């Protein structure tokens, strides 16, 4: 009956805190984690947790997300444990994952409460957006160390943009993020460009700064000429959904309509 849970991502760690659940290990991260986990040991960075550190804690459940399912497969092989890859690529996906965690770990009531609140904020933002006469066309960039990608509707930020009343200029939908060259950025006409950082936010922002100066295409974008290029903070605007989606939805709506 006793659970020993290791969340391997920051979003999963924050979700377990909302569900009032103790954990035996936590991800290594520069982000703020819940205070109740201050004394639990770190088991490595979310994209490459330490197999032997995790095994040392004798867990019953080691938890990851769907966004990096394929690349986490070797980890789980060496661990020799069941892969859990909760859907955190949308509001609806994360709501389903919260219910599942409530069911697995005896926190049904806590899960319902969190879900009702997120649902209520989402519906309210959706209702406001629907009353707006105009909707901005949006291009979403996800910058990682070394390069940038383009976020689709299948990604969390794509879902937020949709909820808040934007129209993604990128229409392909079969993966969360695609090469900056996959859809070609000379066929689109965004009112707004969003730039989200990942992994090494400092390296990423300077990378975005150099790109927009150096690559000749950007100066020709009306979003650039009109100063509607926005750098979003990685918290709450992360590479997956998180329980602060209430703040993300509200903030993005307020950015779009101001
Ligand atoms: C060169 C490319 C990349 C590098 C070097 C990198 C590095 C990192 C780092 C340092 C973190 C931990 C951030 C922290 O301290 O909290 C992280 C987390 C994560 N990354 Fe990446 N990343 C890269 C690309 C990607 C891409 C393309 C994806 C998705 C397709 C991805 C998915 C994730 C996920 C799901 C997490 C966990 C988020 C959480 O903790 O809630 N990464 N990565």
Which residue, 30, 86, 11, 3, is CA-closest to 203? 30
The 3-state DSSP class for residue 192 equals: strand
Q: φ and ψ at 127, to 5 degrees?
A: -65, -40
Q: Which bin fits 20, alpha (ψ -120 to 50), beta or left (φ > 0)?
A: left
Establish whether domains 1-86 and 87-258 are of one fold: yes
Is residue 46 in contact with ligand 1, taking CB distance under 6 Å? yes
Whether residue 72 is annotated as binding a ligand: the answer is no
Altogether, the residues listed in the chain come to a count of 258
Which residue, 23, 29, 24, is CA-closest to 9? 29
* Residue 38 per-residue DSSP state: T
Ligand 1 atom nearest 31 alpha carbon: 16
Is residue 118 in contact with ligand 1, taking CB distance under 6 Å? no
Superfamily of domain 87-258: Nitrogenase molybdenum iron protein domain (3.40.50.1980)
Whether residue 130 is annotated as binding a ligand: the answer is no
User: In whole angstroms, how far apart are CA 224 and each of 185, 192, 228?
Assistant: 14, 8, 6
- This PDB structure is determined at a resolution in Å of 2.2
Is residue 65 in contact with ligand 1, taking CB distance under 6 Å? yes
* Residue 131 per-residue DSSP state: H
30 CA distance to ligand 1 centroid (A)?
12
46 CA distance to ligand 1 centroid (A)?
7
Q: For residue 79, give the H/E element and its range.
A: helix 69-79
Residue 36: both structure tokens together = 């109740």
Which residue, 135, 134, 141, is CA-closest to 196? 141
Contacts of 216 (CB under 8 A, 6+ apart): none
Q: Tell me the domain boundaries of the chain.
A: 1-86, 87-258
User: In whole angstroms, how far apart are CA 110 and each of 5, 23, 179, 218?
Assistant: 17, 16, 39, 46
Residue 208: both structure tokens together = 């975005």
User: In whole angstroms, how far apart are CA 145 and each of 66, 203, 232?
Assistant: 21, 7, 16
Is residue 69 in contact with ligand 1, taking CB distance under 6 Å? no
Which residue, 179, 160, 170, is CA-closest to 240? 160
Q: φ and ψ at 148, to 5 degrees?
A: -125, 155
- Kindly indicate whether the domain formed by 1-86 is annotated with CATH number 3.40.50.1980: yes
Helix-helix angle 245-256:156-163, to 10 degrees: 50
Structure determined via: X-ray
User: In whole angstroms, how far apart are CA 59 and each of 25, 65, 82?
Assistant: 9, 17, 11
Is residue 201 in contact with ligand 1, taking CB distance under 6 Å? no
Nearest alpha carbon, ligand 1 atom 25: 144
Cα distance between residue 100 and residue 113, in whole Å = 14
189 CA distance to ligand 1 centroid (A)?
29
Alpha helix ranges (H) inside the chain: 10-18, 51-56, 69-79, 91-104, 108-131, 156-163, 201-214, 222-225, 245-256
Nearest alpha carbon, ligand 1 atom 14: 29
109 CA distance to ligand 1 centroid (A)?
31
Whether residue 198 is annotated as binding a ligand: the answer is yes
Q: φ and ψ at 230, to 5 degrees?
A: -120, 130
Ligand 1 atom nearest 65 alpha carbon: 35
């Amino acid at each position: 009956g006793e659970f020993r849970i290791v969340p391997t991502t920051v979003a999963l760690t924050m979700t377990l805190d909302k569900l009032d659940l103790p954990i035996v290990g936590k991800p290594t991260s520069y982000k703020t984690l819940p205070n109740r986990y201050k004394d639990v040991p770190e088991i490595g960075q979310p994209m490459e947790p330490n197999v032997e550190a995790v095994k040392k804690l004798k867990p019953t459940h080691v938890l990851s997300v769907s966004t990096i399912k394929d690349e986490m497969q070797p980890f789980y092989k060496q661990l020799n444990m069941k892969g859990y890859f909760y859907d955190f690529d949308s509001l609806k996906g994360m709501q389903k994952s919260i219910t599942q965690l409530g069911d697995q770990f005896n926190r049904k009531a806590q899960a319902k409460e969190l879900n009702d609140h997120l649902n209520s904020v989402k519906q309210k933002i959706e209702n406001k957006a629907a009353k707006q006469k105009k909707h901005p066309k949006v291009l979403i960039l996800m910058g990682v160390p070394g390069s940038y990608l383009v976020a689709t509707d299948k990604s969390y930020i794509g879902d937020l943009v949709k909820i808040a009343g934007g129209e993604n200029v990128i229409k392909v939908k079969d993966r969360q993020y695609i090469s900056s060259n996959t859809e070609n950025l000379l066929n689109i006409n965004p009112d707004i460009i969003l730039r989200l950082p990942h992994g090494m936010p400092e390296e990423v922002k300077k990378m975005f700064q150099k790109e927009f100066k150096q690559n000749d295409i950007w100066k020709h974008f009306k979003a650039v000429k009109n100063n509607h290029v926005y750098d979003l903070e990685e918290v709450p605007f992360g590479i997956t959904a998180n329980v602060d989606a209430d703040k993300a939805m509200t903030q993005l709506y307020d950015l779009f309509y101001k």
